[PDB]
Design a protein around this ligand. Sequence first.
Ligand SMILES: *[C@@H]1O[C@H](CO)[C@@H](O[C@@H]2O[C@H](CO)[C@@H](O)[C@H](O[C@@H]3O[C@H](CO)[C@@H](O)[C@H](O)[C@@H]3O)[C@H]2NC(C)=O)[C@H](O)[C@H]1NC(C)=O
Ligand SMILES: *[C@@H]1O[C@H](CO)[C@@H](O[C@@H]2O[C@H](CO)[C@@H](O)[C@H](O)[C@H]2NC(C)=O)[C@H](O)[C@H]1NC(C)=O
Ligand SMILES: *[C@@H]1O[C@H](CO)[C@@H](O)[C@H](O)[C@H]1NC(C)=O
Ligand SMILES: *[C@H]1O[C@H](CO)[C@H](O)[C@H](O)[C@H]1NC(C)=O
Ligand SMILES: [Ca+2]
Ligand SMILES: [Ca+2]
Ligand SMILES: [Ca+2]
Ligand SMILES: [Ca+2]
Ligand SMILES: [Ca+2]
Ligand SMILES: [Ca+2]
Lengths: 531, 70, 78
Amino acid sequence: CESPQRFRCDNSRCVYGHQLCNGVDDCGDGSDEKEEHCRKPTHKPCTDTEYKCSNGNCISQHYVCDNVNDCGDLSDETGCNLGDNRTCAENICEQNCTQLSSGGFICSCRPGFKPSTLDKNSCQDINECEEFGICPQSCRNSKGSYECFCVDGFKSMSTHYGERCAADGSPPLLLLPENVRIRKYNTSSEKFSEYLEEEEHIQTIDYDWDPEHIGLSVVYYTVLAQGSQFGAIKRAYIPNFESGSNNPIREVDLGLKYLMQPDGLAVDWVGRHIYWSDAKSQRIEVATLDGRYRKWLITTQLDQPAAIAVNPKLGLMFWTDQGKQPKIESAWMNGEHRSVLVSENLGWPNGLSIDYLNDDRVYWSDSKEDVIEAIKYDGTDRRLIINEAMKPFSLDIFEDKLYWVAKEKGEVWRQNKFGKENKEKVLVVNPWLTQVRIFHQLRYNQSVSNPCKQVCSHLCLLRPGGYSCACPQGSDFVTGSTVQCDAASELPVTMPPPCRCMHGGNCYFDENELPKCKCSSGYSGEYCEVG
Amino acid sequence: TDDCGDNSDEENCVPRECSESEFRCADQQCIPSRWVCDQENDCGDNSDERDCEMKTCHPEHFQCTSGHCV
Amino acid sequence: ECGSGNFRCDNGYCIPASWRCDGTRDCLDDTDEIGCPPRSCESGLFLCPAEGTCIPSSWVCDEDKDCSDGADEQQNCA
Ligand SMILES: *[C@@H]1O[C@H](CO)[C@@H](O[C@@H]2O[C@H](CO)[C@@H](O)[C@H](O[C@@H]3O[C@H](CO)[C@@H](O)[C@H](O)[C@@H]3O)[C@H]2NC(C)=O)[C@H](O)[C@H]1NC(C)=O
Ligand SMILES: *[C@@H]1O[C@H](CO)[C@@H](O[C@@H]2O[C@H](CO)[C@@H](O)[C@H](O)[C@H]2NC(C)=O)[C@H](O)[C@H]1NC(C)=O
Ligand SMILES: *[C@@H]1O[C@H](CO)[C@@H](O)[C@H](O)[C@H]1NC(C)=O
Ligand SMILES: *[C@H]1O[C@H](CO)[C@H](O)[C@H](O)[C@H]1NC(C)=O
Ligand SMILES: [Ca+2]
Ligand SMILES: [Ca+2]
Ligand SMILES: [Ca+2]
Ligand SMILES: [Ca+2]
Ligand SMILES: [Ca+2]
Ligand SMILES: [Ca+2]
């Protein structure tokens, strides 16, 4: 049981060759998967008669500046100016100036620097922030150094296989829509709890975080057309707290009639508008959150508009077409400057999500090519994140991990969002599963001010660095003005009061149907808050 | 329509183009233009009746406030 | 034409002067935020225009890509 060929474990049994620290205990006491001898025991000291080169290649000084590369990257030949009449004391080199045995001075760039490219004996600092997945949330550059700082609302938490930053609040829920119901799931508590039930033909989900700050977010959901009856966009409250089943959720239709297959829906929380894409109507259009002032936004060159997304910070909307000519296109929320981001090596782009906290990077899911890719919002630097994704149907990004639904398996799957590590399975649900969406506040930055000055009569759409005026379909501006439109205004729609029993108790309808809670043991108040 | 008796004609059928006075239904079928918003389900799933608050009728037809043409 | 306190956009729609340089477009031709005095910082420092923070003459012309635009080595070091 010799160390050079066998790993002598604590239990006196020895382990053959490469099995040491392979990821499975071949010893039988747990120390086979430990740091000890297998993990980085020595760090190669090299002498004045060698150069430990740019990449750690230690080579004899006789080979340095001999005009034959040993180092691989030619760093043992970098500079190589020659003549014994020359010394390092003359200081030609910017930083680590050194003296060689033959022909005078020879000089290395410092660790974290490369030779100047416009000249030798000179070096730049590497801007390491440009490397993909070098920092989890943010990067600041320094001379051969950097910091993985993370933005406000993210506490730095040292973790396994690297450091990440926490959620600074309640653990994220997943929303999981099936044809007949929407389900919740606490990612930390790992329990389902009842939500919208006795529904039919559901297809997609988005939400507005606590618009009235009364501690109740609202989720928007789509119902498909069935038989000879049209679909609907409907909306309902969802508790941010732990309550469920005890709270009768009341659905209300927005009244957006003449609707067939809204496979894509997104809610602009800044502009207070709802964007949806009807596959059968071959258009993507916009209306206010309560369903007034319907306006067709884009109606040309759309075969089958799939899932869409909006980025109010940059004033850019994104959507996917999965017809005969697959493509991913972005435009202003106004609808101007429509452009195509990616149209090559695309199968069925059916789910799209934006990483707001990381350079506003865009990810999408391809259910035909069986891959998930990421591109910058301008369309450069395309790279596949994960392959063999087993036909992802939908995706969402949260923290340092990416979520998707493996469609026909009905499984929810999870992975490092930078393409590293190995896949993880979260849970298994019906083949009726049609989305995953992380229900959390950090997921949509709530402190993004709406630039609208209330000047607009009916709609105030966003655009990069500002806003614009528009009015419903089949109407035009009053002649000479670009604000007022001739269409008669409509009053905002009143949403019925919700059920709010936080720590427990059951909702109840009185004579005028106002909600009221029967508080549980050891809690009191109108909504059973303190006890 | 199954004419041969063994559905030979309808097998691998690519839907035909519509002509100048026809509207292509949701499920890729052509019907007369005069059937669009006429208070009847003609495309099988009322897809012709879809969203006609925003179009005029034929010159000889009166338009109801609900967008239908009579 | 309109009042003295209203800045006119090229299309004829005139906005209040308070909405000049306010950080947001208001003219359909963006003219209210165009032709507006750019930000600046104290002596020996520089503002990287892409991100808008004060950086020193340590890093402007340090021969490398210190600003987020990467551009100091030609735009400052002319
Ligand atoms: C959500 O969006 C808001 C902006 O709507 C982000 O807030 C800004 O974050 C930056 C990050 O470093 C701060 O500097 C901003 O503070 C302001 O900075 C300017 C100079 O750039 C000063 O003139 C201001 O006085 C102020 O100090 C901050 N702005 C505001 C209005 O809060 C926020 O980071 C972002 N959050 C997430 C999680 O994405
Ligand atoms: C999801 O589960 C987490 C626990 O993993 C819940 O967090 C706790 O919730 C209780 C509720 O009374 C709080 O008092 C605790 O302070 C929370 N603990 C932590 C770790 O923060 C969370 O509330 C659950 N959310 C839902 C909606 O189920
Ligand atoms: C220059 O290189 C040597 C290794 O040969 C290293 O130990 C030293 O720290 C470097 N100089 C400075 C100032 O860091
Ligand atoms: C109204 O729609 C009908 C049917 O499509 C005709 O196209 C007609 O020309 C339209 N009328 C106007 C004024 O555009
Ligand atoms: Ca092992
Ligand atoms: Ca050499
Ligand atoms: Ca650096
Ligand atoms: Ca009809
Ligand atoms: Ca302005
Ligand atoms: Ca520089």
